[PDB]
């Protein structure tokens, strides 16, 4: 918008865990307005992750999430006839949305059987610094260091 200073629509927390972060995650994962199916996928995969990675249900989700959050991105700006990838620091809230969006999109392009099994394995090896989701973060950081001259 040219002038509007938009507010922020509220989001209800998780029913089970009361988490304001998993409500966003369910929204990211859901499709075609089927909220219940997404909650079933996220819950089943989360508990599978908890028992695989020991204990500590939702902070097992945090430990993988903290391994994929970008800290600097690139913005394409056209100069006068050439364009540069100026690297800009990422806002706090944008860091989560980027980290969640990458995990979900990577948790779709796998050969596993279900979506719960598909997503849990991504959430696991991301905590172990493996997987396409963490590679995306590495690629973005590598791209943003090559243009550090333009910061």
């Amino acid at each position: 918008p040219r002038r509007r200073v938009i507010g922020q629509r509220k989001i209800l927390p998780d029913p089970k865990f009361g988490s304001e972060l998993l409500a966003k995650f369910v929204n990211i994962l859901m499709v075609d307005g089927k909220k219940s199916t997404a909650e079933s996928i996220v819950y089943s995969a989360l508990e599978t992750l908890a028992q695989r990675s020991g204990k500590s249900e939702l902070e097992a989700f945090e430990v993988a999430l903290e391994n994929v959050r970008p800290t600097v991105e690139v913005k394409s700006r056209r100069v006068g006839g050439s364009t540069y990838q100026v690297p800009v620091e990422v806002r706090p809230v944008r860091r989560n949305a980027l980290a969640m969006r990458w995990i979900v999109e990577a948790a779709r392009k796998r050969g596993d059987k279900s979506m719960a099994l598909r997503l849990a394995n991504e959430l696991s090896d991301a905590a172990e610094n493996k997987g396409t989701a963490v590679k995306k973060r590495e690629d973005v950081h590598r791209m943003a260091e090559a243009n550090k001259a333009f910061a």
């Binding site: 209800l12 029913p15 089970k16 909220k35 219940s36 909650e39």
Partner: peptide
């Protein structure tokens, strides 16, 4: 049957 309805 929807568990978030119960929470609401």
């Amino acid at each position: 049957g929807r568990e978030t309805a119960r929470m609401v």
